[PDB]
Homo-oligomer: 647 residues x 3
Amino acid sequence: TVRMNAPVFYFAASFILIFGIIVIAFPQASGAWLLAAQNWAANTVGWYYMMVMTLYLVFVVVTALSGFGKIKLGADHDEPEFSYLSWAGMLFAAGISITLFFFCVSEPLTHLLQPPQGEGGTAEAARQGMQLLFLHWGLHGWGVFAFVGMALAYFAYRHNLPLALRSALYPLIGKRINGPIGYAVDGFGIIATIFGLGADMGFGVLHLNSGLDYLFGVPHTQWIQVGLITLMMGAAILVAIAGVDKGVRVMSDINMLLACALLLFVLFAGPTQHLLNTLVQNIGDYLGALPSKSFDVYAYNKPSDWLGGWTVFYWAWWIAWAPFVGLFIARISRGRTIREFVFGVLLIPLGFTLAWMSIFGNSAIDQVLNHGMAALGQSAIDDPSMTLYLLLETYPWSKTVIAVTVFISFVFFVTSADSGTVVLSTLSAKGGNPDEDGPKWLRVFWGVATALITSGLLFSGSIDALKSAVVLTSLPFSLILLLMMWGLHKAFVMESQRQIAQLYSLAPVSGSRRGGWRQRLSQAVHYPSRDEVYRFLDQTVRPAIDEVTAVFVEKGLNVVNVPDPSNDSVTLEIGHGEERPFIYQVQMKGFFTPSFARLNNRRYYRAEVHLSEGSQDYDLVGYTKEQVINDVLDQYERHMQFLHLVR
Amino acid sequence: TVRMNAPVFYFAASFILIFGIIVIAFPQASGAWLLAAQNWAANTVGWYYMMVMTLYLVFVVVTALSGFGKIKLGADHDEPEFSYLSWAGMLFAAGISITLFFFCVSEPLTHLLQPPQGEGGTAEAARQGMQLLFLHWGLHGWGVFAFVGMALAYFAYRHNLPLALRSALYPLIGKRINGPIGYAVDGFGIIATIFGLGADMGFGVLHLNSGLDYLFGVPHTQWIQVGLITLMMGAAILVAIAGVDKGVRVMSDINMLLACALLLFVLFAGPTQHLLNTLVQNIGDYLGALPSKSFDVYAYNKPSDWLGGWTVFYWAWWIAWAPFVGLFIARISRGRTIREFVFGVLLIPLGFTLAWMSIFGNSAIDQVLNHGMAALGQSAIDDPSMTLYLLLETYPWSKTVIAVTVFISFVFFVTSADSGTVVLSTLSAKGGNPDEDGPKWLRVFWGVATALITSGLLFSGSIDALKSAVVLTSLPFSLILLLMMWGLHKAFVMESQRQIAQLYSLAPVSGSRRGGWRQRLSQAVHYPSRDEVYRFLDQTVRPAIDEVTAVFVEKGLNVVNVPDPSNDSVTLEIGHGEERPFIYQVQMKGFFTPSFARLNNRRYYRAEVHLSEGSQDYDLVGYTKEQVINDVLDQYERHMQFLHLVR
Amino acid sequence: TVRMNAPVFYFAASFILIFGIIVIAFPQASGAWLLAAQNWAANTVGWYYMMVMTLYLVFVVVTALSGFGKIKLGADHDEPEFSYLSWAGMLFAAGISITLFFFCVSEPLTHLLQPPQGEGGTAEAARQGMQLLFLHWGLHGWGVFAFVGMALAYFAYRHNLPLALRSALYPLIGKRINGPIGYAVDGFGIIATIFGLGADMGFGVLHLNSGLDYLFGVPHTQWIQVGLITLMMGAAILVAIAGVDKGVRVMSDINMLLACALLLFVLFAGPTQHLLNTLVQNIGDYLGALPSKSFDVYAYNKPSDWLGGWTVFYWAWWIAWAPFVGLFIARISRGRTIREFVFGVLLIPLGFTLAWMSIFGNSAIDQVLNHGMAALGQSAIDDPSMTLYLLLETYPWSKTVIAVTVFISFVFFVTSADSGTVVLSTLSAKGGNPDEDGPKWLRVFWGVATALITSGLLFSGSIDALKSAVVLTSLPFSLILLLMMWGLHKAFVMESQRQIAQLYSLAPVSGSRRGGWRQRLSQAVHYPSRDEVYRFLDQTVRPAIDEVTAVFVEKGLNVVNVPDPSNDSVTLEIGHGEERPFIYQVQMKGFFTPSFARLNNRRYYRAEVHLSEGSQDYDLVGYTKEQVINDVLDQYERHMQFLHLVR
């Protein structure tokens, strides 16, 4: 039965509430305190983000390209419960929101006129600013979602652990994950999600306010935004507390067909040929620049504040969004292998996002360079939420297309911030059936808690406060994301050696022909003592090795005997001219008696058998002398077939 | 018995004849109509060629670097019938002709003085124009020959299908490939070959005319070229209709020793040190620029017509040459693996071609930059077929070396356009022994049909008409080349799972000790009904599972019984403290009776056996109760050896 | 018992002695003769070094990334005798000496002011000159040590050959390696080591002389250096001839903790933030430029002498150091796999070296560019051994830190040039226990022989003579390093096929149930004649194949008989509708009788059995007719389980 998990709820809500309240009470001081922290972080912890963001991508790619990529996330008789398109659509319509509409047009126009290095307004700035757009929305962002999803699905479907963030710390601290060390890991992952989700409603409120101010005469006042947040959130709470389908699985197909029509309209109502050429140019530029652009911090230029507003903000953003998209996509991916999970997450959404960004960015670069539109390029720097409507009003039927864009962008928010509440409430609950969600009084709580965070940062220097508040609260989660990687590596090496131990144990020798299911059963639970095996080596093994070789010598063969200095080993050897000889060596060894056996025994011995390289080891305790001679013979005949094939 | 295949012959010859005739009749109009189509194609379908040309290379490399690279093209007892050098020589002297001699010197001198971007005449233009020469004659061209050859050899030597182009469409449309859908695939592949072969005789006629005009006083008139085409083709028809060896296999060794002597003369009679340095510089430049130069269309520069005369022409050229070289090299490669086929096609010819191009290009760049020869650099732009003889006349014994060059370049054409006719006639014939060629009245036809195509484009703006006619007729074959890739991928995944199904079927359990070759045979063709297995589970399996466990409990072990809610499953379980337990579960399941069994049965059942992960599944229908207890025992003893190795 | 190996000792010492003597006698002529050879080599054999240095790296990486990377260097029951940190420390403190202290500061300041291309003093020269420092001290240098170590460990621990350089030439020339062809391979590898070790004491004598001249008033005269060489060598001979531990294994831990404290002091007493940023910038620059910078010879620029003093010297240096570090690290790496050896050599020392170089280089670039210190940047060009003490005297407590640097740099030399003598004396000795070193009168000899080489080049144009003498004597060893690669490739392909031949030989068929250990033994050494098998095929195999199929036909199955044209093959076939049929074909074949069998037999025959693709081949000579029918039945039942799984 799902109920609240108090040591997580009270640790997260208490941190959220007073921050919200004291940002609501003192706006002038907080707005000034945040711009100091942004400048400090940009310079002090800029290298750290760039270093940690590439480790995740390299890890997931190397894991999917190796032998571990054939491991099924589940049992061997499990099958996928969704189709491929219905899976990819739900995957895409979870990590996309109105920020795409906020950044599609105004970011390239900013990098064209104010480059991080060089003189702007040229055709080199236009080619350099379209690589930054591909870096910020490319493989680095989608490579951490796959990491978190694949780390959560493994431990939950192959080890029957709960579906939570603290489970990946099991190979390190055992079952202490149900104490005070898991309650902090699961608690630092709600704060990042709340801040990354509340910074996304603020980027949508401005977009919608500008869209309505363009059509009607609605001003940019404060009660307008206060009443707009209410409408944006009441539609997302009432969908979460009233049903799931006609929703989570239907909207994913409804909006995916709304987006494609608009993309095709923009492609076929403009300069189609130019766009088709630049789309192919951008892919080559990105693939060529990828390995050296991942570490660029502009360390030999004059100091500046460019890195903290563009490249560090985006990594903080993706890291804050990871623990939600990962836990949502780890629930619909049962019965798949690791390789087709990774290459399925890194194939379709990446393609659609890059196509969108490239078409919408080049369609505006073409008009600022070639057709002389300075009023379009000035608002991208002054008023960044009206540039899209200035570009779209140069098309046929512009007043009918803007009204459809304002409506299409509104469902992109409701599709994400309704699985947001579901995941955020299933993360704060304890017990119950694994494939079953938490109580539906926590959704109404986590929905109301996000508007309070959003409309405290909107009234404190809207855009820069939103950008600066995410870079701080996403810092303690980057270390948990490394502990999870360590644990996953240990769990992988612990089962790379479980496949070796299952092949080597297939029919080492015969002996079942001796018969007797009652005498073979009593012998299968006995652990012999030290010199009890010594009464086996000299009564059965010694009188046989010296007896089978008698027929060998007087039958044409060269049998190399040695004096025995070991008192336990019984070796036999035969030379075949120049190539490899025939080793057959028995040897006693002792081990520790297992737990489920102790009478206090504490020690036992086994008489192994070794051969040439690439063989198996097995014991003969319980054989009969006539069965030992029949074991050295079919190991010799197996040797003669080996020698026939190498030549 | 090989005979004509009318639905292909009449579909190809009819398309060829009227085009030839109406280009012969109206030269002024056709010469003007072709320069419009060239400019149109260069701009409209430039991105498409660049996209499709990289897919083939990536496909073949990834296929050869994976587990599929160990598949032998033939049966497991097949052996290669040729040596390695004799194989590589025939491979090289098939896709090389007089175009090498036409483009070796005049293309770098053109890229040095008229760069696609920058100011020409410098030492940066010289370094940039030697990367284009390596891109146009490098891995992209040799990567499609390997693709077509490996796709044709697989379906013909592992599935016993004919050696034709339509066979790769078998996994898609079944045996409808012998209808109207294969007759178009095999028909669109003769037109591309005819045009790509007729554009190569025109590049040789000009070379030879200039070579004779240098030595003697032969003008550049029209009857000279008309009478020269006759000599170039009558030597290639009379070799095809009079024999094969002293020819296909001897010329490949004769000309390979003519080329090396000339290369070594040019290397050791010039500035050897400079050439040895620049050869190593060019390799590094190419390998560094490869990943980003594959998608370069110059999309941010001022519009121009450079791409349609240089980079799109070369891809169209290689695509038009693929269906001939591929089908020629798929006939001499029986008994090899995929990896040593791909890495053998991409090793020796690439090396020789790149060495030739680099030495001959740098030897002329060095003289235009450093020694001030403007008359050599002007003819490369005005008269591009005399530059080689202007460079070669600055060497010792120039009149004796030019006469040997004119003779060496003449056999390079006869070595290729005599396997051309052989392949083109074996592609238009039907039936007969697979390793056997079509009738030798079709060679005389396809040889005469190519001169008519060549001397209709020579008299219509010689060089540009030849360049423009290949870009159009090679467009419908690029899509067939993608359908073939789809079919090959399906055929690969259909047999990746045939190796799994052959390992899992090795000795699942014992039972042959029961004896009786007549009673074991009658049982091996029976398909039991539903409740007939129910009369097996309760008479043999239930009275045994509850009977073998009796000895277990009263012998020190923790045997976990469960009430049975399934009415068919009979589960047994044992705990070993903390590590993995011992699952042994039987379960009934039903399948569809196969085709070769139906009395109308239509349905049958089997009683499988499942264990822990990584095991095999098998049925017990036909066991004896004493044989079932002896099967749960040696699966338990196999479990205890597994537990001993993990610890 | 270890003793001298005269054909190597007398071949090496004789070459060393007269060179030393005639360089001591005529300094003016030799100093002038060496600067000619340097300029000649730089221009004539510059491309050769660049080509051969990348082959080693590509070879080792491709070998470690493939299936050969799982081969253990030893026997399957061998275990490592050292920990990981204690192993990596000994690995690092063998190939590091005072040259690090000589080149850490003065090389970047030289590349900043005198670039190989461009204008110096800018922020582009500073970024370009920090990539050369990473190229010269990066993967290329550590990739040849791994190659030599992995080539020496394999042949010595898996084939029981001596631990010497000539053993890798065993797969080529057999056991002629104990004649005049191994005595030259092992002799050309002492000269390279002696010269590379004597050029390292000269780089330390100057460093120490400057360090003492800074503190006290010691001049730069000649008797000072003569008396300083004595002190530098008498401390290295007395440690070699008095003990091993408190030394080889303790100093490796003592100095590794001296280095880290100084690195951390330099990092935390300067501009920490700038250094942390540039450290991350340099890694990306290096990884981006690596593939094209490996072949750069500046072939399109004006001729110069830059390449022979910087990039060719470093490759000659690493090649001359390889045969010592490789043979030292191949002695402490028993019981490891190839992959964890390669990725262990290419992980820790590379990281420490690159961190040191980056911090120490940027800490001085920052002061020459940003703080205006021209007297620091002038001595880097005039007097290159005082720049470190000019940089270090701008820190707190400079006179107390310089005195500790002078002491720390002195043990870095003694840690390397005491395993130098050990390896150099175990390389000139013959016989004895493998893991046992040569006599300790050869260490006193090889130590005295190096001072004579060092103080003949110090007095002949100190720095340039040292740089020029290494480029000449390391040329004949680069070819032996290619012969070793060829031999290693042959040894790898000779055992890739030894794993195939050990899987295919596991239980081909049954027959041991026939019983009789005395009759099964006599049959296991018989080689049948030609028509003796013919009296088996017609008495046992023919009357059975035609007898088992009788039950098949009249039991509902389609059995396809064929007339027999072969007179030896006995084929059986069954169609199953459309999918694969059941082939069971017997066939006679003859082979050559092995060596250890010849009565002169010289020939014998076997009756193999073939099936569908992916099967094993075995003979039936010695079966009974009732055992042959029972073999075709359980191959048919194994076929029906295969067909059930593919569908």
